[PDB]
Design a protein around this nucleic acid. Structure first.
Lengths: 149, 185, 134
RNA sequence: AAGUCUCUAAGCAAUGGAUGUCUUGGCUCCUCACACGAUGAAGAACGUGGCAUAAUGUGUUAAGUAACCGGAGUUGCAAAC
RNA sequence: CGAACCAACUGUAGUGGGAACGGUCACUAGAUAUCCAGCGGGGAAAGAAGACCCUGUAGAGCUUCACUUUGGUCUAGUCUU
RNA sequence: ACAUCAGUUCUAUUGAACUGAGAGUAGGGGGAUGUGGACAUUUUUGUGAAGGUGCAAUGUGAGUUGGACUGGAAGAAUGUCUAUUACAGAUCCUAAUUGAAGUAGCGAUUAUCCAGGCUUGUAUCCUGGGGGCUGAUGAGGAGUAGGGUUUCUGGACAACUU
RNA sequence: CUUAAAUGAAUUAGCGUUACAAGUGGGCUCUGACCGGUAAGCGGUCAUGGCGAAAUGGGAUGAACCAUACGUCUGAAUAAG
RNA sequence: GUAGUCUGCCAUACGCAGGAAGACCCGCUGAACUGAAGCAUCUCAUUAAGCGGAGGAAAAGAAACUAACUAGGAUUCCCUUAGUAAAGGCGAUCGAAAAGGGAACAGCCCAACGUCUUAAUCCCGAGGGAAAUGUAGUCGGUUCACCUAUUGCACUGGUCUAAGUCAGAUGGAAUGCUGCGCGAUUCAGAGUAAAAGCCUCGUAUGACCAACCGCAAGCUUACGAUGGACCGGGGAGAGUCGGAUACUUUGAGAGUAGUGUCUUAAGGGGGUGGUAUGUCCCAUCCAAGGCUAAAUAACGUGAGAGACCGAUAGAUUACAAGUAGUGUGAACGAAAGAUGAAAAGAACUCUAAAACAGAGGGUGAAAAGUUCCUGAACUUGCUUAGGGUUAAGGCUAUUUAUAGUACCCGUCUUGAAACACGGAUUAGGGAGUUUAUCUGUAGUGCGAGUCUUUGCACGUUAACUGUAAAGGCGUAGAGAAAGC
């Protein structure tokens, strides 16, 4: 607060840490983003290149609850994080038979699946909307199923 | 503009400083709300204050298909199935909504069972007497959605499928359809 | 500590209400204890003072004299008394004001309202001491 | 090389209203209310009290009167009750 | 009886250097002080943030072959028909 | 010889021994003093609080402290918190006050003089008598507009009528 | 992977890297070199130094020249002179 | 000629309108300073001023609505979406909505059309009048189910409350100082000649006895009301929607909304689905009439709290202030608080022409003696002590009047003692602060998580405490985009 400021120690000093010859004044450059193509261009060119101009295709009436914009992603390395850890320990000790647990991505808010890392060799079933090529490949290789919705 | 900071984006060019709205009301506002709903529940007695009863209802868009919330009111179809009088059921403490008619068969079976649990232990005050105001947040509140696993048996018709070749060669079939009509004309 | 919100505990507000009270409250604010001869008789400690009765001050220039009340004053907030007089430099006695809370009441004169006040506070003091249990 | 002059200091004063201490006044925030008027409002003027110019009451019933509710002198002098 | 302007502190000169025209600096010449009436050499005396000149991406008055327009006038179409 | 700021050798608990350096505008960093109010903790005060005036210490310094006189009721310390928080300047603001200065000056309007009255006190207020002025568009007698009791009698001189 | 042989100029010295931010964007000048000019305490450049922000001593006096760049004191012997 | 109607004007009976206030609210009208480092579109802003009109709240409001789903379901407001989609000399800048979470939650009825009801309706108080140029009422019929009485508005004062004026010294006065008691559902606060749990008012807390105890609306047991199914039906707002064009307006982009001009539909059909245009499907609603509480707003007016100010502050105003006072006028607008516990406010005498002015003498603890507490500085008077041809002051050194030294501060400047500007003296005021969106460093807590706030539940109540679910940022990016 007001005690700890540098302004408080600069009593006596006549300019308060702002120069004699220049004189600290309200409008040096011009207001806000002004002179971006003229006299403050060096700042724009140096720090924020590509600022000026128009690119892309105009999108009218964009909504983000559509299943065109809205795809949350999850990765193959996990999935097992969605289920609690007592489940998959029982699923490890099993024959080629029955009781293969369904990891529902869509309940938890994850539509697509994306293979960035490994799995174990447990059987399981991924219910999701979509997959990648390599994510579908890795789930087969572990020994499990790729359901669509 | 100076240094490495991001472009100066402050929406403060209008005279905002005349149109200020400070919220020092908030805890006094809380009591004006709170003292109203106590002066309600005494006047409403012997009827239950947490009511009126409202339906369970699925939310619309793709990213809330999971969740289920409280609606506005039950349909005239759902009341008559449960055993109620559509017009009179407003005054029995059940909210009614004539408009909604996109609710499919699964969510009707909830809301019929919801009204039956109400109509099972609704009772009526006679003439002279007075009855104790039985509050019950368990009945009116929605049941929380959860599923644990639903583990199931493996098909052994999985390696038959490959989804990615089914996806891509539907698109590559569609691409050649347009390019034939463009080329031939 | 006070629970009632509508009474104020700021010193500005209390002084302003005190000095600019209504007439009925100011008579109650001007009051004094009885002497122990009258306490056993009437069964009350504290009473408001009138122009009938007489009063006796410990500690002062005018130490330990009885004398009747010539005038109560509610704006000036003090009591004139018989006997309590210094002369001027001119040969002229002037009565000298004293605040009643320094003073003990030695004799009292009845009024319908004064008897009706006393019979209330006697019955009140019997209830409260039975409640506290002394 | 003279001084009652001029310059400096201290003590006691004159002038002036700083400092310090006081506070029936503000400022803000929250709460409750808005039920003014042809049944003459808001605003203006002038009257009227024993000594009353301003303000406040009040309108030839003019610091008030009647009724109900409080219940004993709410201030200088004078007078009455 | 009884004001005001103005006032950094001040109030003798010469040369020297110095923001290049010193009351204060250095080196010299002078001097005892305090008053009166005159007086206009000096205090680059006082009165006005220079009305001249220039600056400003500052104005205003006026002009037109500057750039934009708005109105007025003329002409056409439609309605009243 | 002493102080400060670095560093080197060591050191638990904040230190030791020793070596080196010294300008500073614009400007930056570190530690410290003081002021209005707050929350704890601890006190002082009618055997005289704050404040104020002089004097003696003390700190490199911003400051702090003692005792004397004055005053007559509240003040201060330690640790954290907070700010309408420290002035010689702004042709600064408000309030009071100097020199210049007992100086500049007391104008314009006919002209005053002598004896009495009233008084502590008159050239001035009144009486009497000289000498004058205004010299019918007159400081004569009366009215619009405007002023609003300035009209009249009695008493009064703190101020005003150079 | 490994077969041989060494730390193979002087003098000095720890070196490397990142982040955030102030003031500044009117300069002046000694000695030499130089462009324009009759020349200027003139205008425009170059190299090291100085002033600006640097006291003290010396050149009587001086921002810039000479000696030298500074804690508070007490001595000794010097520099420019 | 008289007897109905139609149209117009006049007179009269009975209640209504106007004016005030205008912070908030509703409808119009409408700037510029400013920013863009110029300026004209743009921005400030659909803002200020102006005109018109409401209420304690107003306005909005019961789908010609969203959406594309595992579907929502009137209006209003808060959080988020989002500084995003979009707009923009694509510059400056500007900028929404659905969904999701929460507060609150309430629906109703004219028109016409039921091709029925003998106006079955309403006002006036025995009968007159309005109304057929249209008031009033449930579409008709069978048959099972079922409901039965409460709901708005209105609500009043008074009485009573614990424990030391303890003892001693000081003092004008004791509440302070030393020592011993007692109260507490009351140690909030104030008054009292001085600092008070126990001197007084109160505070606290339950007990006590009077005043009321009614206004409308609806009831009240069945062919009375309501609903489901089946049978047989009627209709649903025209210079209006819409179109072209012009202007204003918007995030709305080959038009978001409004308005002028001209033009103008359909009703087994029409609107909407954010790129103009025709065209084929699917989905979803039915415009052009009306009423409606609650959550919400509040720079006006009237009537507890504080880490705020303490008389040059705080409101212009602590006081006979919107006063004194100024201007033809619209308008403008000060200064000014404190005697003492209590007036005990200074009798009487002396000098004097004397309500001139003192001097004695008194009041009070102390003159504190009347814009009187404290009474600083500048300036002045008296007394005491020294210096003086060097304008004065400063610093260093001592035997204290000498020696040496010493240009006037602040300021722009390459350069100020300058004949550069500011500065007569003194006191008191007097200038890098705060908000939003971010940047980086350091501290702190948790950590693939984290934030608990919009709000609800608590409370010794704006705090603190507890907690459900969303949401924010992070966890995956590149591309104009499709797809990845």
């Amino acid at each position: 607060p007001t005690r700890f400021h540098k302004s408080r120690k600069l009593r006596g000093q006549v300019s308060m840490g702002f120069g004699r010859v220049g004189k600290h004044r309200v409008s040096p450059g011009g207001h806000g983003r002004a002179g971006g193509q003229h006299h403050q261009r060096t700042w724009f060119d140096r720090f924020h290149p590509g600022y000026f101009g128009k690119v892309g295709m105009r999108h009218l009436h964009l909504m983000k609850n559509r299943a065109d914009e809205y795809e949350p992603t999850i990765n193959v390395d996990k999935l097992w994080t969605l289920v609690p850890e007592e489940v998959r320990v029982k699923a490890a000790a099993a024959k080629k038979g029955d009781a293969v647990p369904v990891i529902d991505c869509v309940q938890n808010g994850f539509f697509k699946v994306l293979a960035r890392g490994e799995l174990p060799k447990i059987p399981f079933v991924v219910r999701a909307k979509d997959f990648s090529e390599e994510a579908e490949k890795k789930i087969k290789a572990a020994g499990g199923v790729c359901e669509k919705v | 503009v100076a240094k490495n900071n991001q472009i100066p984006n402050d929406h403060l060019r209008k005279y905002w400083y005349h149109r200020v709205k400070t919220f020092f009301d908030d805890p006094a506002r809380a009591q004006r709300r709170r003292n109203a709903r106590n002066l309600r529940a005494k006047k409403i007695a012997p009827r239950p204050a947490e009511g009126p009863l409202r339906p369970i209802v699925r939310c619309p868009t793709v990213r809330y298909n999971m969740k289920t919330r409280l609606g506005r009111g039950f349909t005239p179809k759902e009341l008559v199935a449960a055993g109620f009088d559509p017009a009179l059921a407003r005054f029995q403490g059940i909210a009614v909504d004539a408009r909604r008619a996109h609710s499919k068969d699964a969510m009707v079976k909830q809301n019929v069972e919801r009204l039956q649990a109400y109509k099972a232990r609704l009772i009526k005050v006679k003439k002279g007497e007075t009855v104790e105001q039985v509050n019950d947040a368990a009945l009116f509140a929605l049941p929380k959605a959860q599923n644990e696993i639903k583990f199931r048996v493996i098909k052994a018709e999985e390696a038959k499928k490959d989804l990615f070749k089914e996806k891509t060669d539907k698109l590559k079939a569609f691409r050649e359809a347009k390019k034939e009509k463009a080329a031939a004309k | 500590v006070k629970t009632n919100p509508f009474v104020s505990s700021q010193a500005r507000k209390v002084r302003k209400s005190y000095f600019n009270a209504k007439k009925d409250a100011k008579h109650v604010a001007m009051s004094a204890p009885l002497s122990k001869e009258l306490q056993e008789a009437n069964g009350i400690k504290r009473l408001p003072i009138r122009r009938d009765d007489e009063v006796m001050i410990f500690s002062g220039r005018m130490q330990n004299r009885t004398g009747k009340v010539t005038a109560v004053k509610l704006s000036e907030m003090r009591i004139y008394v018989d006997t309590f007089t210094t002369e001027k430099i001119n040969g002229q006695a002037v009565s000298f004001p004293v605040h009643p809370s320094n003073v003990v009441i030695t004799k009292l004169k009845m009024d319908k309202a004064r008897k009706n006040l006393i019979e209330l506070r006697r019955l009140g003091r019997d209830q409260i001491l039975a409640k506290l249990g002394h």
